[PDB]
Amino acid sequence: KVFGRCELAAAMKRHGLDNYRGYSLGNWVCAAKFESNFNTQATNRNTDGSTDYGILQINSRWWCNDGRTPGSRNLCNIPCSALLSSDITASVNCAKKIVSDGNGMNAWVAWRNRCKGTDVQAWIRGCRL
């Protein structure tokens, strides 16, 4: 599913990301924009042989099982394919663990490089939230 911007803002807010670990909703929407272009089906292989999955490009070395990432963990206890669903619940639950791990949203390198320090409330402009 390709979310609209305000559609995704509303879903992320419903699931508790606004101000989660102190990160306002626009940070999360900005991260999804540059990680996946709002596409839940996005996947991208990494040089280390892991893959990133879904709206927040959650990676198979630590967080989910894809069966092809040797000596990986599954700290979110899900199959990576769960992260591709139109229902973002599993991606949100796993993102909450990731952002709690010690480096905050710096775990998403698109957030660090394209969202951090910018006017992230622009991403929720106009939305009825």
Residue numbers in the entry: 1 to 129
Paper text:
In structure B, derived from crystals grown in 0.8 M succinic acid at pH 7.0, noncovalent binding of cis-[VIVO(empp)2(H2O)] on the protein surface was found (occupancy = 0.40). This vanadium-containing fragment is noncovalently bound to HEWL through hydrogen bonds with N main chain atoms of Arg5, Cys6, and Glu7, water molecules, and Arg14 side chain from a symmetry-related molecule. For cis-[VIVO(empp)2(H2O)] only the isomer with two equatorial phenolate-O is revealed; furthermore, only the enantiomer OC-6–24-Λ interacts with the protein. A site for noncovalent binding, close to main chain atoms of Arg5, Cys6, and Glu7, is also conserved.
